[PDB]
Structures are given as C-alpha cells and as structure tokens.
C-alpha cells in the first residue's frame, strides 16, 4: 500500500524550518505574496535541486565534498561552501533550541509566566490581551514582553551587546552537552522507536491547528495568509526569502542531502522518495502555517490592531503565537511542556545530523590527524566548544540582532542561492542533464520526464540569477522587526558570513588551476572531466558513456 512506503521514508522531513521559520518569513513578507514565489521556487528549484542532490549522492555513494570531486574536479569548492554554510548554521541554530529549553524550563510551574503581565520584567505599558479591547496609546502584549524583556532582554541595538544572559547561557550549554554526548556515543538521531519521534510532532501540530482554526478571529488571519498582494511581488526581497526558505526547509546546499543520499542503494527509486518527502515537507509548512496564522488573526481582533503589526516580524513569531495558543487551551501548562518538548525534539534531530554531518566531513577532509578514536573524541568536543563560543554572542542582550544577521546571511539569502545556482550549472550544463538521466534510468528503473532537466538547465539558474541581480539593484538593507536599521558595519559583518561561504567556489577554482600543470585550456579541461562518477561494479552498474 502507501502507509508502509510512508513508514519506510520515516518522518525526518519536518523540522524547525517548518514550524518556526516559514511562519515568520511569510509573516514578514506581507501575507500571501510570500506564497507565490514560495511555490514557484518549490516546483522550479526546490524539488529539482533536492532530487539532484539525492541522486548525485546515491549515484556516487559519496558525501558532500567527494561527490563533487567525482562529478567535476573543477567547481569542487561547492563542498567547502556547504561546509561553511552548515558550520554557521550549527552556530546560530542551536540558539533556537536554547530558547526552546528556556521556555520549557519556565513552563514547569503552576501558571505560565507569559499568560499575564504582572511580573518584574513587564513594561508598565503592558495590558492583558483580553483587556486591550474589553475596555501612551501603544500598549504592548504580555506574550511579547516575556519574549523581548525576559527571554531576550533586547538591547537598543547590535552596537549594545550588554551583559551576557547567564540563564540563557546555561541553556545553550545543555543542548550542546546533549548534542556532544549523543554524537560522541553514536546515538541515533531518533531515539528508541521512531514512532514517537515522528508521530508526536504531527499530533501536537493538529492539536495546535484545531485550536487555531477554532479561534474566533481565525477568519481574518487565514485571509491574510492566503490572499496575495501584487505590490509586494515587485520587491526582490520576497523572492529571496521564499526561494531560500525552501532551501532551508529541505536542508539542501548544506551537503546533508548528498550524504543522506549516499546510503541509498544504486538500484533504488529515490525519485518517488524525493517527490513524496518534498511535498510532505512543504505540505507541513503550508498546513502548519494555517495554525499560526489563525492565532495572529485571533490576536489581531483581540488587541484591535492590524494583523501585520500584532506580533514580531522576525524570529520569535513561533515564540509569540504558539505560546499564545497554548494559553487558550485546557490545562495550558500541560500543552506548553508538550509543544516545547516537540520543538526541542525537532531541533535536536536536525542538529544531531548537521553537527555530525560536518564532523564527518571535517575528519575525512583532513585525515592522518583526525583518526577515529582519541583524535575524533577530542575533535567532537572541539567543534562543540568553538560553536558554543561563537553561539555565546547571540545569548547577550543584543544577541537577538546577531541572530537575525546569521539567519538572514549565514545560511540563507544569496549564499544559499550561490550554491544552488552552481550545483545546477555544473550538472545541467557542464556534466549535462541528459547524461544524468542515462544514470537515472539505469538507477531508478525508468527515465523521468523533462521536468527535472528543464529545471536544472533553465528554471533554477534564471531564478537564482534573477533574484541575485534584482536584490542588488533594489538593495534594501536588513532590518529587525521592521523598525531597527542595522549599522553599516553590521551589514558588512553579515555580508562576510555570506561571502565566506560564497568565496569558497571561486577560491577553490583558483587553487585547482594553480595546482595542476600544463596549458591553461588543457588545465581547465582536465579539471572538468568526471573521475568515473559511478565506478562501483558491486551492483549491476553501467559505465558512464
């Protein structure tokens, strides 16, 4: 049937990129004007690049970096670019789990601290959500006050780091301690039975979806979610966010799908897997968007404010809407523990794979010094120790702004499109899209349609290049919560994170040509020759020509 096939592919597609990132990127970019580029990218580059990464991984049986070594010795810097991207992602991504751990710890009491605002951290302008319309014109919300004046202690700006938050600092250590021990002891990403680690996130989502859709104001929120705005489409930013939100959700361009695809058998039909997993992953984001955008509709009518100004147009919308949802449920404390355990579980499985993803890449990149044993065990703590130290800048009072810089630049925006464009440029144009099908029809048993070939050859390069050009022409600098303008150096620092990964592609190109000897035309030609991509003879595998 189909349930066994769904059980076969497990439930690792859903992550924090679906329940935390997509809700606020859609919220930041107006309403439904995010969905049009979202689906355009999903069906033009998202699924095509995802299947391309999986099919290369299973074609070469090689990880993130060595796969490019086999496919095209030139442009091999895509692996190192993916390594830098995943390193910065690991640095700033566990901060979300630190926030989730802090929320979970604070939820272990009789009364949820963010239900009412009568505590020390609350601004005198706070008013209860019910009392805002039941009876200094701007009145802030008790949920927002907990997030900004307790969890974040937001400082006037990124130029005011303030004092390190010790309560958050320990929480950032605990998740790294959890991540350190699990990776070092070889613990599987999903613990014991995978059923609980997979069905529980869905079970809580339907609980939140049912509550959200039943809320009195949910009608307005869904209209905001779905009905698009043509004017917002002219902005090149919404195409940057939607294009890379697909890439973030699918964990492509990170070198993780290629490693995941390397374990598939040569005669395995991954095409149905990628199509199913892609639709399930994006289908969750669209469906879970209904849950969170229904709460905002209820929140907006409760406070008598616009939907676009009811919450934070940045990270922490899932830490503002979802904690608000669990407050309007029977036994609110019980659901808050469950949601933030689900939120913690979803991040941990993603972080276990990615941190081990680079650690496996890093040790294999530099052997003879990272031997499996006393050398690897100290290395695992080394990566975690350094990633914890760089992650400590996002724990300070002004750490929220640094987190937004990393979210916008480190593993999103132009850096992700830079890798995705070069993956499709090498395969479709240098290697040849037709040459890849000759492998695929041998591999999955049947040659696919012309969708994939006409997506790597034209659609993805046009989408990636077109977004990059118009973002530079209509350059709008990054802002946090649509009211804070970043200092010029901060954008320069943010661009360095994007440039550090992007510069890997041209730098390795220079390195390879200088290393090789001979005529330049022969030199570049030699580095463009695939080193027997599928050299495996263990399985009934045909030769590349």
In the numeric block, the tokens 């606020």 are attached to 24
Indicate the Cα dihedral angle 175, 177, 180, 184, nearest 10°. -130
- Reference 31, options 408, 296, 417, 214; nearest CA is 296
Site for ligand CCCCCCCC in 29-88 (CB under 6 A): 80, 83-84, 87
Tell me the backbone φ, ψ of residue 511, rounded to 5 degrees: -60, -45
Judged by CB, which is closer to ligand CLR: 216, or 487?
487
Site for ligand CCCCC in 376-395 (CB under 6 A): 383, 386-387, 390
Work out which of 511, 522, 535, 539 binds ligand CCCCCCCCCCCC, going by CB under 6 A. Answer: 511
User: Is position 462 an interface residue for ligand CCCCCC (rule: CB under 6 A)?
Assistant: no
User: Is position 106 an interface residue for ligand CCCCCCCCCCCC (rule: CB under 6 A)?
Assistant: no
H-helix or E-strand spanning residue 479: strand 479-480
Judged by CB, which is closer to ligand CCCCC: 383, or 417?
383
User: Is position 382 an interface residue for ligand CCCCCCCC (rule: CB under 6 A)?
Assistant: no
Closest approach, Cβ 313 to ligand NAG, in A, equals 11
Please give the residue whose beta carbon sits closest to ligand NAG in the complex.
137
User: Is position 140 an interface residue for ligand CCCCCCCC (rule: CB under 6 A)?
Assistant: no
> Contact, 310 vs 299, CB < 8 A?
yes
Closest approach, Cβ 64 to ligand CCCCCCCC, in A, equals 11
Judged by CB, which is closer to ligand NAG: 138, or 368?
138
- Reference 295, options 327, 267, 273; nearest CA is 327
User: Is position 496 an interface residue for ligand D10 (rule: CB under 6 A)?
Assistant: yes
User: Is position 496 an interface residue for ligand CLR (rule: CB under 6 A)?
Assistant: no
CB-CB neighbours of 493 under 10 Å: 15
CA distance 120 to 492: 37
Closest approach, Cβ 410 to ligand CCCCCCCC, in A, equals 9
Stretch near ligand CCCCCC under the rule CB under 6 A, chosen from 98-106, 199-207, 242-250, 379-387: 199-207
User: Is position 120 an interface residue for ligand CCCCCCCC (rule: CB under 6 A)?
Assistant: no
**Per-residue string for binding with Cl ion, 239-258, x by CB under 5 A?**
----------x---------
CB-CB neighbours of 174 under 10 Å: 14
Indicate the Cα dihedral angle 252, 420, 279, 336, nearest 10°. 50
User: b vs e for 103-115, b when ≥16 Cβ sit within 10 Å of the residue's Cβ?
Assistant: bbebbeeeebbbb
Judged by CB, which is closer to ligand CCCCCCCCCCCC: 264, or 501?
501
CA distance 380 to 249: 26
- Give how many residues touch ligand D10 by CB under 6 A: 7
CA distance 305 to 297: 10
User: Is position 449 an interface residue for ligand D10 (rule: CB under 6 A)?
Assistant: yes
Q: Which does 35 bind (CB under 5 to 8 A by kind): Cl ion, ligand CCCCCCCC, ligand CCCCCC, none?
A: ligand CCCCCC
Q: Which two tokens stand for residue 376?
A: 């690897």
Tell me the backbone φ, ψ of residue 164, rounded to 5 degrees: -60, 135
Q: Which two tokens stand for residue 133?
A: 């319309």
CB-CB neighbours of 459 under 10 Å: 19
CA distance 85 to 91: 10
Q: Which two tokens stand for residue 481?
A: 């919560």
**Per-residue string for binding with ligand CCCCCC, 327-366, x by CB under 6 A?**
--x-------------------------------------
User: Is position 161 an interface residue for ligand CLR (rule: CB under 6 A)?
Assistant: yes
Stretch near ligand CCCCCCCCCCCC under the rule CB under 6 A, chosen from 149-157, 205-213, 354-362, 496-504: 496-504
Q: Which residues form the interface with ligand NAG (CB under 6 A)?
A: 137-138, 309
Stretch near ligand D10 under the rule CB under 6 A, chosen from 155-163, 332-340, 410-418, 487-495: 487-495
Closest approach, Cβ 284 to ligand CCCCCC, in A, equals 5
Site for ligand CCCCC in 66-95 (CB under 6 A): 87, 91
Q: Which does 493 bind (CB under 5 to 8 A by kind): ligand CCCCCC, ligand D10, ligand NAG, none?
A: ligand D10
H-helix or E-strand spanning residue 484: strand 484-485
Judged by CB, which is closer to ligand NAG: 287, or 308?
308
In the numeric block, the tokens 């090689």 are attached to 62
3-state secondary structure (DSSP) of residue 309: helix
CA distance 263 to 268: 10
- Reference 205, options 14, 459, 358, 56; nearest CA is 14
Stretch near ligand D10 under the rule CB under 6 A, chosen from 188-196, 407-415, 489-497, 512-520: 489-497
H-helix or E-strand spanning residue 480: strand 479-480
CA distance 461 to 45: 9
List the alpha helices (DSSP H) in 20-165: 22-28, 35-41, 47-60, 66-71, 77-106, 129-134, 142-146
CA distance 451 to 428: 13
Closest approach, Cβ 39 to ligand D10, in A, equals 8
**Per-residue string for binding with Cl ion, 19-58, x by CB under 5 A?**
---x------------------------------------
Work out which of 137, 368, 488, 515 binds ligand CLR, going by CB under 6 A. Answer: 488
> Contact, 168 vs 97, CB < 8 A?
no
In the numeric block, the tokens 């031997």 are attached to 371
Q: Which does 520 bind (CB under 5 to 8 A by kind): Cl ion, ligand CCCCC, ligand CCCCCCCCCCCC, none?
A: ligand CCCCCCCCCCCC
Q: Under the rule (CB under 6 A), what is the footprint of ligand CCCCCCCC?
A: 80, 83-84, 87, 105-106, 108-109, 167, 475, 488, 491-492, 495, 500
Residues that bind ligand CCCCC (CB under 6 A): 87, 91, 383, 386-387, 390
């Amino acid at each position: 049937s189909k349930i066994d096939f769904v059980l076969s592919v497990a439930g690792g597609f859903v992550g924090l990129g679906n329940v935390w990132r997509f809700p606020y990127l859609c919220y930041k970019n107006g309403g439904g004007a995010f969905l049009i580029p979202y689906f355009i990218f999903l069906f033009g580059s998202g699924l095509p690049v995802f299947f391309l990464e999986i099919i290369i991984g299973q074609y070469t049986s090689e990880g993130g970096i060595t796969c490019w070594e086999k496919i095209c010795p030139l442009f091999s810097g895509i692996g190192y670019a993916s390594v830098v991207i995943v390193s910065l992602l690991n640095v700033y991504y566990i901060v979300i789990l630190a926030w989730a751990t802090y929320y979970l710890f604070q939820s272990f009491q009789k009364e949820l601290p963010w239900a009412h605002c009568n505590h020390s951290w609350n601004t005198p302008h706070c008013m209860e959500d019910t009392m805002r319309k039941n009876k200094s014109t701007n009145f802030t919300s008790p949920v927002i006050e907990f997030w900004e004046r307790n969890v974040l202690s937001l400082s006037p700006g990124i130029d005011h780091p303030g004092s390190l938050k010790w309560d958050l600092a320990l929480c950032l250590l605990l998740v790294w301690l959890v991540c350190f021990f699990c990776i070092w002891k070889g613990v599987r990403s999903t613990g014991k039975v995978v059923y609980f680690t997979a069905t529980f996130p869905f079970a809580m989502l339907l609980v939140l979806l049912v509550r959200g859709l039943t809320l009195p104001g949910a009608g307005a929120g869904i209209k905001f979610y779905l009905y698009p705005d043509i004017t917002r489409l002219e902005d090149p930013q919404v195409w940057i966010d939607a294009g890379t939100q697909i890439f973030f959700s699918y964990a492509i361009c990170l070198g993780a799908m290629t490693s995941l695809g390397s374990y598939n058998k040569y005669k395995y039909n991954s095409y149905r897997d990628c199509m199913l997993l892609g639709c399930l992953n994006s289908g969750t984001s669209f469906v879970s968007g209904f849950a969170i955008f229904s709460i905002l509709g209820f929140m907006a009518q409760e406070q008598g404010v616009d939907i676009a100004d009811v919450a934070e147009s940045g990270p922490g919308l899932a830490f503002i809407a979802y904690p608000k949802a669990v407050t309007m449920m029977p036994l609110p404390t019980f659901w808050s523990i469950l949601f933030f355990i689900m939120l913690l579980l979803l991040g941990l499985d993603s972080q276990f794979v990615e941190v081990e993803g680079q650690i496996t890449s890093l040790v294999d990149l530099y052997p003879s010094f990272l031997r499996k044993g006393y050398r690897r065990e100290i290395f695992i703590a080394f990566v975690c120790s350094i990633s914890y130290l760089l992650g400590l800048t996002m724990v300070t009072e002004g750490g929220m702004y640094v987190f937004q810089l990393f979210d916008y630049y480190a593993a999103s925006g132009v850096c992700l499109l830079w890798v995705a464009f070069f993956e499709c440029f090498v395969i479709a144009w240098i290697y040849g899209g037709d040459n890849l099908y000759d492998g695929i029809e041998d591999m999955i048993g049947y040659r696919p349609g012309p969708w994939m070939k006409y997506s790597w050859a034209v659609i993805t390069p046009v989408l990636c290049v077109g977004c990059f050009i118009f973002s530079l022409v209509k350059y709008v600098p990054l802002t946090y919560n649509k009211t804070y303008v970043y200092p010029n150096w901060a954008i320069g620092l943010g661009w360095s994170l994007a440039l550090s990964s992007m510069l890997c592609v041209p730098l390795v190109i220079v390195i390879r040509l200088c290393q090789t000897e001979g005529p330049f035309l022969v030199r570049v030609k030699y580095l463009l020759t695939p080193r027997e991509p599928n050299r495996w003879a263990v399985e009934r595998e045909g030769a590349t020509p």
